[PDB]
């Protein structure tokens, strides 16, 4: 009985592979061959924000391109003012194990999650001038890995129990549960239109979800190991993944297949974070080589290196207007580049 | 050309930095430990006189020194991703049950994996060998045989140089030293010397176990100071 089902599944998988390969006629390399390169660029750290006494795991730029929040192992979640390099808030955390944080697009809420299986939302703008816990969202059977605000009232989470969820804050209970993966889910990235997002798991596969229905639409399997971080192309029809094989890959939503892979022989270490530039021409990355790289998104040529951390780079983010780049590391200093 | 509000915001940031300095200064006084074991090892009952599904916490004091022992029981078998956090802890505590011989190889492989980790090249491990009483009863019964599992036990060198406990069975001493040497061989196979292992034998009912951890953490910190002072 089950043997017939397996045979049918294998036959359909072969059919899908053949159909996907039939649409590959010209590779992106031979199309983008006659393009003037970007040359060489150099970016120097413009500000270095001190105040953390421990490793920095995660960060998220604010929407106004000036404020950002960062989470550390010491148990403090503290918000910076980038231009003057002050501290706006310092939020003591109940659990010292914090692995993700996010800044709401409206700018008056901040989310936090880690090994305690609970996503905690903090209300920043309130009377009596103190940041109190708004809600403690619970219901995940594995450690929270990433969280991203959809709007003021909804937030999407990716947990360490092989599933993602979409919460409603006021009700305080899940309204959708994405359960298609087979391994641990490690990352997540919304889309500019805020109608469909993507996720990354330890089974070396990324899935393109939908927030209305809650059904996986497409799956991309081209990685030889777990993918650690994921972004979204600003056009909204492509994204970039990063695994511990020292290879970033560019996937397309409409073509349903990998387009380019960014690899080099001098690097054999893992990748922790990836992000895109304002025009998407530049694909940033963050490696375990105590430094970062800057990849040309159309030629896969290393067009820059940002070596300023004595420890590994954990988190990376590009400003909404594209004015600056901020990276956090385990040396308790996160520096802004431009 | 500075606004009063910017002056006040800078003063607020200075006060926040002062509070962070004070809190971080206070938080460093205590030492940190990571307790983990495969299964059926009684790792919970290591310390019992002195004493949120994802994380389990335990706080105990000995001679005015605070220890936070962190145990995680809400995770899967594969732990390679949440272990990167525990790289600045003082020492990892490993507990195994030598009573059960059927799953000794699993614990040995687990010790191999934790020893040869890439993020734990600077943490020393404190090894515990739990439930020695049951091992004593099993070996005195004469039912189970070690040659079936470990062919190297049949031909073993007498530990004449090693001093045994005063009054004990030679076969029991041979078996327990063989197990401990099997662990120590994997401990020293790397031969790096950056960090070492601290084996200990533990009874089912043992009143004192925090003193052992204290005397190993003191040795760990002393070795770190010796290394950092250019004396080694």
């Amino acid at each position, epitope marked *: 009985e089950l043997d017939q089902l397996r045979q049918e599944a294998e036959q359909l998988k072969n059919q899908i592979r053949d159909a996907r390969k039939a649409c590959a006629d010209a590779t992106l390399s031979q199309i983008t061959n006659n393009i003037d390169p970007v040359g060489r660029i150099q970016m120097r750290t413009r500000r270095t924000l001190r105040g953390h006494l421990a490793k920095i795991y995660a960060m998220h730029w604010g929407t106004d391109s*000036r*404020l950002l929040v960062s989470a550390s192992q010491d148990g403090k979640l503290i918000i910076w*003012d980038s*231009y*003057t390099t*002050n501290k*706006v*808030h310092a939020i003591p955390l109940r659990s010292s194990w914090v692995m993700t944080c996010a800044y709401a697009p409206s*700018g008056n809420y901040v989310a936090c999650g880690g090994l305690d299986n609970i996503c905690s939302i903090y209300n920043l*703008k309130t*009377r*009596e*001038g*103190n940041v109190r816990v708004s809600r403690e969202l619970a219901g995940h059977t594995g450690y929270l890995s990433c969280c991203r605000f959809l709007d003021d009232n909804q937030i999407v989470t990716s947990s360490g129990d092989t599933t993602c969820a979409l919460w409603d804050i006021e009700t305080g209970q899940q309204t959708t549960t994405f359960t298609g993966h087979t391994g641990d889910v490690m990352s997540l990235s919304l889309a500019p239109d805020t109608r469909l997002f993507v996720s990354g798991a330890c089974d070396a596969s990324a899935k393109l979800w939908d927030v209305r229905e809650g059904m996986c639409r497409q799956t991309f399997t081209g990685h030889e190991s777990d993918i650690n971080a994921i972004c979204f192309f600003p056009n909204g029809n492509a994204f970039a993944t990063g695994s511990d094989d020292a290879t970033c890959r560019l996937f397309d939503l409409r073509a349903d297949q990998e387009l380019m892979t960014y690899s080099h022989d001098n690097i054999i270490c893992g990748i922790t974070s990836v992000s895109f530039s304002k025009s998407g021409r530049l694909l940033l990355a963050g490696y375990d080589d105590f430094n970062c790289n800057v990849w040309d998104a159309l030629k896969a040529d290393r067009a820059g290196v940002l070596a300023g951390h004595d420890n590994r780079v954990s988190c990376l983010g590009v400003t909404d207007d594209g004015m600056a780049v901020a990276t956090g590391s385990w040396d308790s200093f996160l520096k802004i580049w431009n | *050309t500075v*606004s*009063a*509000e*910017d*002056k*006040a*915001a800078a*003063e*607020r940031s*200075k*006060m926040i930095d002062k509070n962070l300095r004070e809190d971080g200064e206070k938080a460093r006084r205590t030492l940190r430990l990571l307790l983990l074991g495969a299964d059926n090892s009684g790792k919970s009952t290591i310390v019992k006189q002195m004493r949120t599904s994802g994380i389990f916490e335990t706080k105990f004091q000995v001679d005015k020194v605070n220890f936070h022992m962190f145990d995680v029981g809400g995770q899967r078998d594969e732990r390679r991703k949440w272990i990167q956090c525990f790289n600045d802890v003082t020492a990892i505590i490993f507990v195994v049950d030598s009573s059960d011989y059927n799953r000794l190889q699993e614990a040995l492989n687990d010790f191999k994996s934790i020893w040869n980790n890439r993020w734990l090249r600077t943490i020393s491990v404190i090894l515990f060998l739990n439930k020695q009483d049951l091992l004593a009863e099993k070996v005195l019964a004469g039912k189970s045989k070690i040659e079936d599992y470990f062919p190297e036990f049949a031909r073993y060198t007498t530990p004449e140089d090693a001093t045994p406990e005063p009054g004990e069975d030679p076969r029991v001493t041979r078996a327990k030293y063989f197990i401990r040497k099997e662990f120590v061989d994997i401990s020293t196979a790397s031969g790096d010397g950056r960090h070492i292992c601290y084996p200990h034998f533990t009874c089912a009912v043992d009143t004192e176990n925090a003193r052992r951890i204290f005397n190993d953490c003191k040795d760990i910190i002393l070795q770190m100071n010796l290394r950092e002072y250019n004396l080694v």
Partner: single-chain antibody
Amino acid sequence: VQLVESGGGLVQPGGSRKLSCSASGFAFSSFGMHVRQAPEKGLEWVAYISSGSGTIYYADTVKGRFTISRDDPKNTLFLQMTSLRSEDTAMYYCVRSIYYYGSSPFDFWGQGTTLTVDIVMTQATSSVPVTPGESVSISCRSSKSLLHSNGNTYLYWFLQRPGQSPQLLIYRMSNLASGVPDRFSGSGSGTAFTLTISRLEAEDVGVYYCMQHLEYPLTFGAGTKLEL
């Protein structure tokens, strides 16, 4: 969130009196606290005590004889007065303020207790007759430019109903306070500031004060009364 005040009454000239403002309902240690009003004159700044008592400023009129301290555990701040003169009769307001990026200082004011014994800003309007349901505008001039290099214009709008303490309406010339209806709107350029009200209706008649926060001392406007 309340601020109650104690002290006042008849005082002979040259004496001493202590005003205590007790806060109950918010984190008192995180706020910088500040403002008096004569019987028939607009608000006049008096002094300022920072967060954690790390910085103190006074107006020149009250320098050397007014002292401020704050009992953070007691959740209260005081004002010690010595060598009172015949012209210090006023009503003293306990005012809170918190300063960080995106903050809204002067957002709450005390009840006020009667006691009886530099950037120059002018509001040309004194009394403007108005009809209900009619849009109005209130202008407040300045001596020097308030627009800073970073791009923030430090100007505030306060409203006092009859027999009530004033409250924040607009901070930094564009941003609205919390609980203020959207009809209020502030706009202008450097050295020219306007407050525009649309769909004006009842329970909006009072005295409108304009203040600067570019540098100390903080100078208010003369005020503009609205009448039917």
